[PDB]
Amino acid sequence: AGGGHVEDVPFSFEGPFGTFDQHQLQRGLQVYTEVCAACHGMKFVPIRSLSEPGGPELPEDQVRAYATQFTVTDEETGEDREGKPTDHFPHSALENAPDLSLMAKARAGFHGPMGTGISQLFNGIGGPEYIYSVLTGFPEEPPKCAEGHEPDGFYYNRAFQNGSVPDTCKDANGVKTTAGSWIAMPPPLMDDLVEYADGHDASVHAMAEDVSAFLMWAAEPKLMARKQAGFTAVMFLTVLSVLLYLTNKRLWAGVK
Amino acid sequence: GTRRDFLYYATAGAGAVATGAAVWPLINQMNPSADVQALASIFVDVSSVEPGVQLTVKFLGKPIFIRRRTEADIELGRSVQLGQLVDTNARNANIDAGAEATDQNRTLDEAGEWLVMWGVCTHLGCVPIGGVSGDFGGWFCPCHGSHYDSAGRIRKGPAPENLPIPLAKFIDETTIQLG
Protein backbone atom coordinates (compact mmCIF):
# COMPACT_ATOMS: atom_id res chain seq x y z
CA ALA A 1 0.00 0.00 0.00
CA GLY A 2 1.01 3.64 0.29
CA GLY A 3 0.15 7.13 1.44
CA GLY A 4 -2.60 9.06 -0.31
CA HIS A 5 -3.47 12.73 -0.66
CA VAL A 6 -5.86 14.21 1.91
CA GLU A 7 -7.40 17.68 1.76
CA ASP A 8 -6.23 19.58 4.83
CA VAL A 9 -9.14 20.99 6.84
CA PRO A 10 -8.91 23.80 9.45
CA PHE A 11 -10.51 21.93 12.34
CA SER A 12 -11.27 23.84 15.52
CA PHE A 13 -9.08 21.49 17.60
CA GLU A 14 -5.81 22.06 15.73
CA GLY A 15 -2.74 23.57 17.36
CA PRO A 16 -1.85 24.05 21.02
CA PHE A 17 -4.84 26.32 21.66
CA GLY A 18 -7.33 23.93 20.07
CA THR A 19 -10.75 23.18 21.54
CA PHE A 20 -13.62 21.02 20.37
CA ASP A 21 -16.54 23.07 19.09
CA GLN A 22 -19.42 21.82 21.21
CA HIS A 23 -22.10 22.50 18.60
CA GLN A 24 -20.00 20.87 15.89
CA LEU A 25 -19.58 17.79 18.07
CA GLN A 26 -23.33 17.66 18.66
CA ARG A 27 -23.96 17.85 14.91
CA GLY A 28 -21.36 15.13 14.40
CA LEU A 29 -23.12 12.93 16.93
CA GLN A 30 -26.42 13.52 15.15
CA VAL A 31 -25.07 12.60 11.73
CA TYR A 32 -23.25 9.58 13.20
CA THR A 33 -26.49 8.34 14.76
CA GLU A 34 -28.62 8.79 11.64
CA VAL A 35 -26.10 7.60 9.02
CA CYS A 36 -22.94 5.92 10.27
CA ALA A 37 -24.38 3.95 13.19
CA ALA A 38 -26.38 1.71 10.84
CA CYS A 39 -23.23 -0.12 9.67
CA HIS A 40 -20.64 1.00 12.26
CA GLY A 41 -20.14 0.81 16.01
CA MET A 42 -17.84 2.27 18.67
CA LYS A 43 -17.22 -0.47 21.22
CA PHE A 44 -14.69 1.53 23.26
CA VAL A 45 -16.80 4.69 23.69
CA PRO A 46 -19.08 4.84 26.77
CA ILE A 47 -22.41 6.52 26.09
CA ARG A 48 -22.07 8.35 29.42
CA SER A 49 -19.04 10.12 27.93
CA LEU A 50 -21.48 12.27 25.94
CA SER A 51 -22.15 14.19 29.17
CA GLU A 52 -18.52 14.58 30.22
CA PRO A 53 -16.80 17.98 30.06
CA GLY A 54 -14.78 18.90 27.01
CA GLY A 55 -17.03 17.08 24.56
CA PRO A 56 -20.60 17.32 23.28
CA GLU A 57 -21.56 18.00 26.93
CA LEU A 58 -25.17 17.00 26.43
CA PRO A 59 -27.49 17.14 29.46
CA GLU A 60 -27.57 14.01 31.59
CA ASP A 61 -31.26 13.36 30.89
CA GLN A 62 -30.77 13.74 27.14
CA VAL A 63 -27.89 11.25 27.17
CA ARG A 64 -29.98 8.83 29.23
CA ALA A 65 -32.80 9.14 26.70
CA TYR A 66 -30.33 8.66 23.84
CA ALA A 67 -28.95 5.47 25.37
CA THR A 68 -32.43 3.91 25.37
CA GLN A 69 -32.43 3.51 21.57
CA PHE A 70 -29.95 0.60 21.79
CA THR A 71 -30.88 -2.99 22.59
CA VAL A 72 -28.06 -4.57 24.60
CA THR A 73 -27.61 -8.07 26.01
CA ASP A 74 -27.30 -7.78 29.78
CA GLU A 75 -24.11 -9.16 31.30
CA GLU A 76 -25.94 -10.03 34.53
CA THR A 77 -28.72 -12.16 33.01
CA GLY A 78 -27.90 -12.48 29.30
CA GLU A 79 -31.23 -10.97 28.22
CA ASP A 80 -31.93 -8.10 25.85
CA ARG A 81 -32.75 -4.76 27.46
CA GLU A 82 -32.75 -1.05 26.72
CA GLY A 83 -29.34 0.56 26.79
CA LYS A 84 -28.07 2.64 29.69
CA PRO A 85 -25.46 5.41 29.84
CA THR A 86 -22.98 3.01 31.44
CA ASP A 87 -23.03 0.86 28.28
CA HIS A 88 -20.70 1.44 25.35
CA PHE A 89 -22.03 2.01 21.86
CA PRO A 90 -23.02 -1.17 19.99
CA HIS A 91 -20.52 -3.11 17.93
CA SER A 92 -20.53 -2.86 14.15
CA ALA A 93 -23.85 -4.20 12.89
CA LEU A 94 -22.18 -4.95 9.54
CA GLU A 95 -19.18 -7.26 9.89
CA ASN A 96 -17.00 -5.75 7.15
CA ALA A 97 -17.03 -2.31 8.77
CA PRO A 98 -14.39 -1.53 11.41
CA ASP A 99 -14.86 0.15 14.75
CA LEU A 100 -14.98 3.94 14.50
CA SER A 101 -13.86 4.53 18.09
CA LEU A 102 -10.16 5.01 17.26
CA MET A 103 -10.40 5.61 13.50
CA ALA A 104 -9.29 9.23 13.87
CA LYS A 105 -6.05 7.95 15.45
CA ALA A 106 -5.72 4.75 13.38
CA ARG A 107 -5.18 6.62 10.10
CA ALA A 108 -2.44 9.02 9.01
CA GLY A 109 -3.66 11.52 6.44
CA PHE A 110 -0.20 13.06 5.98
CA HIS A 111 2.81 11.13 4.70
CA GLY A 112 6.22 12.00 3.33
CA PRO A 113 7.91 13.94 1.90
CA MET A 114 10.28 10.95 1.60
CA GLY A 115 9.55 9.01 4.78
CA THR A 116 11.30 11.60 6.95
CA GLY A 117 8.09 12.40 8.83
CA ILE A 118 8.50 16.16 8.43
CA SER A 119 5.00 16.51 6.96
CA GLN A 120 3.32 15.05 10.04
CA LEU A 121 5.44 17.30 12.26
CA PHE A 122 3.91 20.48 10.82
CA ASN A 123 0.50 19.02 9.84
CA GLY A 124 -0.21 16.46 12.57
CA ILE A 125 -1.20 12.85 12.03
CA GLY A 126 -4.18 13.87 9.90
CA GLY A 127 -6.67 11.19 10.88
CA PRO A 128 -9.66 13.55 10.87
CA GLU A 129 -8.50 14.90 7.51
CA TYR A 130 -8.33 11.34 6.20
CA ILE A 131 -11.87 10.64 7.38
CA TYR A 132 -13.12 13.85 5.78
CA SER A 133 -11.38 12.99 2.50
CA VAL A 134 -12.78 9.46 2.53
CA LEU A 135 -16.35 10.62 3.14
CA THR A 136 -16.23 13.25 0.39
CA GLY A 137 -13.92 11.28 -1.91
CA PHE A 138 -16.61 9.55 -3.97
CA PRO A 139 -16.80 11.06 -7.48
CA GLU A 140 -19.89 10.92 -9.65
CA GLU A 141 -18.15 9.02 -12.48
CA PRO A 142 -15.36 6.46 -11.88
CA PRO A 143 -12.05 6.67 -13.76
CA LYS A 144 -12.24 6.04 -17.49
CA CYS A 145 -9.87 3.05 -17.37
CA ALA A 146 -12.06 1.23 -14.86
CA GLU A 147 -15.28 1.75 -16.83
CA GLY A 148 -16.65 -1.63 -17.88
CA HIS A 149 -14.33 -3.38 -15.40
CA GLU A 150 -15.54 -2.06 -12.05
CA PRO A 151 -15.54 -4.62 -9.21
CA ASP A 152 -19.02 -5.65 -8.16
CA GLY A 153 -20.05 -4.39 -4.74
CA PHE A 154 -17.26 -1.79 -4.60
CA TYR A 155 -17.17 1.96 -5.23
CA TYR A 156 -14.29 4.20 -6.25
CA ASN A 157 -12.91 6.56 -3.60
CA ARG A 158 -10.25 9.18 -4.33
CA ALA A 159 -8.89 9.01 -0.77
CA PHE A 160 -8.95 5.26 -0.11
CA GLN A 161 -5.55 3.63 -0.66
CA ASN A 162 -6.04 0.00 0.42
CA GLY A 163 -8.65 -1.49 -1.92
CA SER A 164 -8.46 -3.48 -5.12
CA VAL A 165 -7.91 -1.84 -8.50
CA PRO A 166 -9.03 -3.07 -11.95
CA ASP A 167 -6.31 -4.50 -14.16
CA THR A 168 -7.13 -1.78 -16.70
CA CYS A 169 -6.12 1.08 -14.41
CA LYS A 170 -2.81 -0.54 -13.46
CA ASP A 171 0.45 0.24 -15.26
CA ALA A 172 3.23 -1.91 -16.69
CA ASN A 173 5.23 -1.62 -13.46
CA GLY A 174 2.19 -2.93 -11.56
CA VAL A 175 1.26 0.26 -9.66
CA LYS A 176 -2.21 1.77 -9.83
CA THR A 177 -2.53 4.82 -12.06
CA THR A 178 -5.68 6.06 -10.30
CA ALA A 179 -5.12 8.18 -7.21
CA GLY A 180 -7.96 6.41 -5.41
CA SER A 181 -9.01 2.83 -4.84
CA TRP A 182 -12.17 0.74 -4.63
CA ILE A 183 -13.73 0.62 -1.16
CA ALA A 184 -16.54 -1.69 -0.04
CA MET A 185 -18.78 1.14 1.24
CA PRO A 186 -21.38 3.12 -0.77
CA PRO A 187 -21.34 6.92 -0.57
CA PRO A 188 -22.86 7.52 2.88
CA LEU A 189 -23.25 11.29 2.74
CA MET A 190 -25.71 13.23 0.59
CA ASP A 191 -26.99 16.80 0.54
CA ASP A 192 -29.64 17.48 3.21
CA LEU A 193 -29.42 13.90 4.48
CA VAL A 194 -29.68 15.05 8.12
CA GLU A 195 -31.89 17.87 9.40
CA TYR A 196 -29.88 20.03 11.80
CA ALA A 197 -32.12 21.76 14.32
CA ASP A 198 -29.92 24.85 14.60
CA GLY A 199 -30.17 25.44 10.84
CA HIS A 200 -26.53 24.73 10.01
CA ASP A 201 -26.13 23.64 6.40
CA ALA A 202 -26.29 19.89 5.74
CA SER A 203 -24.07 19.67 2.66
CA VAL A 204 -21.69 16.74 2.25
CA HIS A 205 -18.75 18.98 3.16
CA ALA A 206 -20.31 20.29 6.38
CA MET A 207 -21.59 16.86 7.39
CA ALA A 208 -18.23 15.21 6.71
CA GLU A 209 -16.42 17.87 8.74
CA ASP A 210 -18.86 17.33 11.61
CA VAL A 211 -18.43 13.55 11.53
CA SER A 212 -14.65 13.92 11.46
CA ALA A 213 -14.73 16.22 14.48
CA PHE A 214 -17.00 13.86 16.40
CA LEU A 215 -14.84 10.84 15.56
CA MET A 216 -11.74 12.75 16.66
CA TRP A 217 -13.47 13.38 19.97
CA ALA A 218 -14.42 9.72 20.28
CA ALA A 219 -10.84 8.61 19.57
CA GLU A 220 -9.31 11.01 22.12
CA PRO A 221 -12.09 12.36 24.36
CA LYS A 222 -9.51 13.93 26.72
CA LEU A 223 -7.59 15.98 24.16
CA MET A 224 -8.32 19.35 25.76
CA ALA A 225 -7.42 17.98 29.20
CA ARG A 226 -4.20 16.66 27.68
CA LYS A 227 -3.34 20.06 26.22
CA GLN A 228 -4.09 21.81 29.51
CA ALA A 229 -1.89 19.37 31.41
CA GLY A 230 0.83 19.84 28.81
CA PHE A 231 0.74 23.61 29.20
CA THR A 232 0.81 23.32 32.99
CA ALA A 233 3.80 20.97 32.92
CA VAL A 234 5.59 23.11 30.35
CA MET A 235 5.18 26.21 32.50
CA PHE A 236 6.29 24.46 35.69
CA LEU A 237 9.39 23.17 33.91
CA THR A 238 10.02 26.58 32.32
CA VAL A 239 10.07 28.37 35.67
CA LEU A 240 12.16 25.57 37.18
CA SER A 241 14.63 25.63 34.29
CA VAL A 242 15.09 29.40 34.45
CA LEU A 243 15.70 29.22 38.20
CA LEU A 244 18.12 26.32 37.75
CA TYR A 245 19.95 28.24 35.02
CA LEU A 246 20.41 31.20 37.35
CA THR A 247 21.53 28.91 40.17
CA ASN A 248 24.05 27.12 37.94
CA LYS A 249 25.42 30.42 36.65
CA ARG A 250 25.84 31.76 40.19
CA LEU A 251 27.48 28.53 41.38
CA TRP A 252 29.95 28.26 38.51
CA ALA A 253 30.84 31.96 38.69
CA GLY A 254 32.89 31.08 41.76
CA VAL A 255 35.20 28.61 40.02
CA LYS A 256 35.21 30.28 36.57
CA GLY B 1 24.02 35.68 51.38
CA THR B 2 20.69 37.44 51.00
CA ARG B 3 20.35 37.16 47.22
CA ARG B 4 22.22 33.84 47.23
CA ASP B 5 19.81 32.26 49.70
CA PHE B 6 16.83 33.85 47.97
CA LEU B 7 17.77 32.32 44.62
CA TYR B 8 18.69 28.91 46.01
CA TYR B 9 15.55 28.53 48.10
CA ALA B 10 13.37 29.84 45.27
CA THR B 11 14.82 27.11 43.06
CA ALA B 12 14.14 24.57 45.81
CA GLY B 13 10.55 25.79 46.13
CA ALA B 14 9.89 25.60 42.40
CA GLY B 15 11.35 22.10 42.39
CA ALA B 16 9.11 21.10 45.29
CA VAL B 17 6.04 22.45 43.51
CA ALA B 18 6.92 20.50 40.36
CA THR B 19 7.57 17.37 42.42
CA GLY B 20 4.18 17.67 44.11
CA ALA B 21 2.42 18.29 40.81
CA ALA B 22 4.01 15.12 39.44
CA VAL B 23 3.34 13.08 42.59
CA TRP B 24 -0.35 13.92 43.00
CA PRO B 25 -1.53 12.08 39.84
CA LEU B 26 0.32 8.95 40.99
CA ILE B 27 -1.82 8.85 44.14
CA ASN B 28 -4.96 10.10 42.39
CA GLN B 29 -5.06 7.42 39.69
CA MET B 30 -5.88 4.87 42.42
CA ASN B 31 -9.15 6.63 43.26
CA PRO B 32 -12.38 5.36 41.68
CA SER B 33 -12.42 5.82 37.92
CA ALA B 34 -15.12 7.44 35.82
CA ASP B 35 -16.40 3.95 35.01
CA VAL B 36 -16.94 3.10 38.68
CA GLN B 37 -18.31 6.51 39.66
CA ALA B 38 -20.83 6.40 36.81
CA LEU B 39 -22.72 3.45 38.30
CA ALA B 40 -26.36 4.48 38.76
CA SER B 41 -29.53 3.08 40.29
CA ILE B 42 -30.98 -0.31 39.40
CA PHE B 43 -34.52 -1.70 39.49
CA VAL B 44 -35.52 -4.87 41.35
CA ASP B 45 -38.78 -6.76 40.79
CA VAL B 46 -40.50 -7.92 43.98
CA SER B 47 -43.65 -9.26 42.34
CA SER B 48 -42.83 -12.85 43.37
CA VAL B 49 -41.63 -12.27 46.95
CA GLU B 50 -43.74 -13.71 49.76
CA PRO B 51 -43.61 -12.90 53.48
CA GLY B 52 -40.58 -14.26 55.29
CA VAL B 53 -38.35 -14.74 52.22
CA GLN B 54 -35.33 -12.52 51.64
CA LEU B 55 -34.03 -11.43 48.23
CA THR B 56 -30.31 -10.67 47.86
CA VAL B 57 -29.27 -8.46 44.94
CA LYS B 58 -25.93 -6.96 43.92
CA PHE B 59 -25.50 -3.18 43.98
CA LEU B 60 -22.25 -1.21 44.04
CA GLY B 61 -20.49 -4.55 44.38
CA LYS B 62 -22.22 -5.32 47.68
CA PRO B 63 -25.31 -7.30 48.70
CA ILE B 64 -28.64 -5.60 49.33
CA PHE B 65 -31.38 -7.44 51.22
CA ILE B 66 -35.05 -6.92 50.38
CA ARG B 67 -37.18 -8.76 52.93
CA ARG B 68 -40.97 -8.97 53.22
CA ARG B 69 -41.25 -9.03 57.01
CA THR B 70 -43.86 -11.45 58.33
CA GLU B 71 -46.38 -10.59 61.02
CA ALA B 72 -44.10 -12.05 63.69
CA ASP B 73 -41.13 -9.98 62.50
CA ILE B 74 -43.26 -6.82 62.44
CA GLU B 75 -44.56 -7.49 65.95
CA LEU B 76 -41.07 -8.22 67.31
CA GLY B 77 -39.43 -5.19 65.71
CA ARG B 78 -42.01 -2.71 66.98
CA SER B 79 -41.84 -3.97 70.57
CA VAL B 80 -38.30 -2.79 71.32
CA GLN B 81 -38.12 0.83 72.46
CA LEU B 82 -35.18 3.17 71.93
CA GLY B 83 -33.78 2.33 75.36
CA GLN B 84 -32.12 -0.98 74.52
CA LEU B 85 -30.96 -0.05 71.01
CA VAL B 86 -27.19 0.25 70.72
CA ASP B 87 -27.49 3.32 68.48
CA THR B 88 -30.53 5.57 68.23
CA ASN B 89 -30.00 6.68 64.62
CA ALA B 90 -32.10 4.88 62.02
CA ARG B 91 -29.26 5.48 59.54
CA ASN B 92 -31.86 5.60 56.76
CA ALA B 93 -30.85 7.74 53.79
CA ASN B 94 -34.51 8.23 52.77
CA ILE B 95 -35.46 10.39 55.79
CA ASP B 96 -33.96 13.03 58.07
CA ALA B 97 -30.50 12.09 59.30
CA GLY B 98 -31.50 12.79 62.90
CA ALA B 99 -34.44 10.37 62.99
CA GLU B 100 -34.54 7.68 65.65
CA ALA B 101 -34.17 3.97 64.88
CA THR B 102 -37.87 3.17 65.06
CA ASP B 103 -39.31 0.35 62.98
CA GLN B 104 -41.39 2.90 61.07
CA ASN B 105 -38.16 4.72 60.17
CA ARG B 106 -36.41 1.46 59.16
CA THR B 107 -38.88 0.48 56.41
CA LEU B 108 -40.08 1.76 53.05
CA ASP B 109 -43.81 1.54 53.88
CA GLU B 110 -45.96 2.59 56.81
CA ALA B 111 -46.92 -1.01 57.67
CA GLY B 112 -43.32 -2.17 58.01
CA GLU B 113 -43.96 -5.08 55.66
CA TRP B 114 -40.98 -4.24 53.42
CA LEU B 115 -37.36 -3.87 54.50
CA VAL B 116 -34.68 -2.77 52.02
CA MET B 117 -31.25 -2.74 53.61
CA TRP B 118 -27.53 -3.04 53.04
CA GLY B 119 -26.47 -6.61 53.69
CA VAL B 120 -23.06 -5.43 54.89
CA CYS B 121 -22.04 -5.67 58.54
CA THR B 122 -21.06 -2.25 59.85
CA HIS B 123 -18.11 -3.72 61.77
CA LEU B 124 -15.78 -4.81 58.96
CA GLY B 125 -18.08 -5.56 56.02
CA CYS B 126 -19.11 -9.21 56.33
CA VAL B 127 -22.55 -10.39 55.19
CA PRO B 128 -25.02 -11.17 58.02
CA ILE B 129 -26.86 -14.48 57.65
CA GLY B 130 -30.63 -14.25 57.34
CA GLY B 131 -33.39 -16.67 58.20
CA VAL B 132 -34.33 -15.25 61.61
CA SER B 133 -30.84 -15.98 62.94
CA GLY B 134 -29.18 -14.45 65.98
CA ASP B 135 -30.63 -13.96 69.44
CA PHE B 136 -33.10 -11.24 68.35
CA GLY B 137 -35.05 -12.84 65.49
CA GLY B 138 -33.03 -11.05 62.81
CA TRP B 139 -29.62 -11.42 61.18
CA PHE B 140 -26.34 -12.83 62.47
CA CYS B 141 -22.88 -11.85 61.27
CA PRO B 142 -20.66 -14.89 61.96
CA CYS B 143 -17.32 -13.21 61.22
CA HIS B 144 -17.34 -11.72 64.73
CA GLY B 145 -20.66 -12.92 66.14
CA SER B 146 -22.77 -9.78 65.80
CA HIS B 147 -26.56 -9.81 66.10
CA TYR B 148 -29.05 -7.60 64.26
CA ASP B 149 -32.70 -7.16 65.21
CA SER B 150 -35.65 -8.10 62.99
CA ALA B 151 -35.56 -4.50 61.72
CA GLY B 152 -31.81 -4.66 61.07
CA ARG B 153 -30.86 -2.68 64.18
CA ILE B 154 -27.65 -3.67 65.95
CA ARG B 155 -28.32 -5.37 69.29
CA LYS B 156 -25.13 -7.26 70.20
CA GLY B 157 -21.58 -7.59 68.96
CA PRO B 158 -18.74 -5.30 67.89
CA ALA B 159 -20.78 -3.60 65.16
CA PRO B 160 -21.01 0.13 66.02
CA GLU B 161 -24.02 1.02 63.86
CA ASN B 162 -27.23 -0.37 62.42
CA LEU B 163 -27.26 -1.85 58.94
CA PRO B 164 -27.67 1.19 56.65
CA ILE B 165 -30.63 1.62 54.31
CA PRO B 166 -29.90 3.12 50.87
CA LEU B 167 -32.15 5.35 48.80
CA ALA B 168 -35.19 3.35 47.73
CA LYS B 169 -38.80 3.79 46.66
CA PHE B 170 -41.70 1.90 45.07
CA ILE B 171 -41.95 3.44 41.61
CA ASP B 172 -44.46 0.72 40.66
CA GLU B 173 -46.55 -1.74 42.64
CA THR B 174 -43.88 -4.47 42.36
CA THR B 175 -40.62 -2.65 41.65
CA ILE B 176 -38.01 -0.99 43.87
CA GLN B 177 -35.46 1.55 42.61
CA LEU B 178 -32.19 0.94 44.46
CA GLY B 179 -29.81 3.90 44.46
Binding site: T232, M235 | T2, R3, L7, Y9, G13, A14, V17
Partner: peptide
Amino acid sequence: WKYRYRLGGFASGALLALALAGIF
Protein backbone atom coordinates in the same frame (compact mmCIF):
# COMPACT_ATOMS: atom_id res chain seq x y z
CA TRP C 1 12.71 37.56 60.51
CA LYS C 2 15.86 35.51 61.06
CA TYR C 3 15.22 33.63 57.78
CA ARG C 4 13.48 36.14 55.51
CA TYR C 5 15.22 35.03 52.33
CA ARG C 6 15.39 31.32 53.17
CA LEU C 7 11.67 31.36 54.01
CA GLY C 8 10.43 34.11 51.70
CA GLY C 9 12.50 32.77 48.83
CA PHE C 10 10.96 29.31 49.14
CA ALA C 11 7.40 30.63 49.20
CA SER C 12 8.06 33.16 46.44
CA GLY C 13 9.53 30.49 44.17
CA ALA C 14 6.58 28.20 44.83
CA LEU C 15 4.02 30.96 44.26
CA LEU C 16 5.58 31.98 40.94
CA ALA C 17 5.21 28.42 39.66
CA LEU C 18 1.64 27.96 40.88
CA ALA C 19 0.51 31.50 40.06
CA LEU C 20 1.77 31.24 36.48
CA ALA C 21 0.73 27.60 35.98
CA GLY C 22 -2.89 28.74 36.35
CA ILE C 23 -2.58 31.34 33.59
CA PHE C 24 -3.95 28.91 31.00
